[PDB]
Amino acid sequence: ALRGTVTDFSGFDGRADAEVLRKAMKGLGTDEDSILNLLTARSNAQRQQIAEEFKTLFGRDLVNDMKSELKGKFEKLIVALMKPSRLYDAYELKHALKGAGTDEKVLTEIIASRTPEELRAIKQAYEEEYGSNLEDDVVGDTKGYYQRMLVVLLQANRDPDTAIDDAQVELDAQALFQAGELKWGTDEEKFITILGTRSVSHLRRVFDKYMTISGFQIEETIDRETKGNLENLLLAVVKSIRSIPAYLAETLYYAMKGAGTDDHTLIRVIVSRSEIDLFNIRKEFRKNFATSLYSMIKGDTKGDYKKALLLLCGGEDD
Numbered sequence: 001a002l003r004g005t006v007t008d009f010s011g012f013d014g015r016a017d018a019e020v021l022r023k024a025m026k027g028l029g030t031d032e033d034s035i036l037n038l039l040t041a042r043s044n045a046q047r048q049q050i051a052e053e054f055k056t057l058f059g060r061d062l063v064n065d066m067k068s069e070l071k072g073k074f075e076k077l078i079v080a081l082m083k084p085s086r087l088y089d090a091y092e093l094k095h096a097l098k099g100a101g102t103d104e105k106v107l108t109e110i111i112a113s114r115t116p117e118e119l120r121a122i123k124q125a126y127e128e129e130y131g132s133n134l135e136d137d138v139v140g141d142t143k144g145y146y147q148r149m150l151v152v153l154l155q156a157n158r159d160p161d162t163a164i165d166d167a168q169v170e171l172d173a174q175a176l177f178q179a180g181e182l183k184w185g186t187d188e189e190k191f192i193t194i195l196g197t198r199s200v201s202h203l204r205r206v207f208d209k210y211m212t213i214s215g216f217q218i219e220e221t222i223d224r225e226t227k228g229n230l231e232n233l234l235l236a237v238v239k240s241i242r243s244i245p246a247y248l249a250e251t252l253y254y255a256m257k258g259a260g261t262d263d264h265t266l267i268r269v270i271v272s273r274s275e276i277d278l279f280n281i282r283k284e285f286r287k288n289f290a291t292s293l294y295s296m297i298k299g300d301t302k303g304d305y306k307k308a309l310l311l312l313c314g315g316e317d318d
């Protein structure tokens with residue numbers, strides 16, 4: 001089903017690669033091209049072996065050297081590529097959760113698009129690396145029903161996907177209907193329980209049945225009924241239930257579409273997903289926004305930063 005764009009290099013020689021990186025950084029100047037070309041052609045697991053080979057050979061920390069050598073978004077991108085996959089999302093959450101100014105967008109984006117299996121793994125690493133419990137931090141920086149929805153998601157206790165029970169589908173569609181459009185005000189608690197705990201396959205049927213019953217797509221009602229953080233979260237969960245790739249492909253588009261670029265989001269989605277479903281993200285991107293993810297990036301991004309991105313991305317036609 002899911003297809004990433006980066007895979008294990010076959011003739012991988014951890015030690016050979018390490019000296020190419022040493023050569024590329026020794027002396028004045030930097031051969032940002034050898035780095036960029038080597039690192040985007042190796043999987044994340046290989047990038048980690050390369051990192052330790054470099055240390056056992058030169059007694060130097062690879063990431064630390066590049067940090068001092070590279071500059072700008074190119075650096076930020078290459079630094080993101082070096083982060084172990086099992087730690088990156090935790091890392092991104094901690095930096096958004098550094099709530100002197102919490103970045104809800106990132107919280108909503110990661111928590112809504114990651115599966116329960118991924119949420120569990122993410123909560124694990126986060127505590128092992130930051131000696132903090134993810135939930136505690138979230139509850140600490142967020143308030144209201146937004147905070148509640150995230151904690152519901154954080155439990156990673158979504159029902160399993162079993163045979164759909166039509167009566168059950170009718171029950172839930174009608175319930176959301178009464179909890180929103182037919183109610184003076186909104187019963188957000190009801191939306192959160194259903195959207196946050198029913199299985200994915202079940203909710204897909206509910207969204208369809210809800211359409212038939214009310215004449216509205218759940219997304220429209222959500223926009224009619226809610227506002228702010230909760231709305232975004234609810235839209236993100238709904239969109240993810242329908243298709244994680246499409247949701248991610250959509251968040252990518254809007255990161256660029258406007259003027260300039262939301263480099264962080266562009267970096268996070270591409271890196272975090274390069275080895276999961278970035279190929280799929282690419283298809284749903286073309287399908288909808290009419291342009292290739294490639295062409296889109298290629299035209300928004302500059303220099304080296306643009307080249308590494310295009311290499312990780314790939315697919316001119318997608």
Ligand SMILES: [Ca+2]
Nearest residue numbers: 025027028029
């Ligand atoms: Ca140098």
Ligand SMILES: [Ca+2]
Nearest residue numbers: 067068070071
């Ligand atoms: Ca620097």
Ligand SMILES: [Ca+2]
Nearest residue numbers: 180181183185
């Ligand atoms: Ca209402």
Ligand SMILES: [Ca+2]
Nearest residue numbers: 223226227231
């Ligand atoms: Ca609204």
Ligand SMILES: [Ca+2]
Nearest residue numbers: 256258259260
């Ligand atoms: Ca632009």
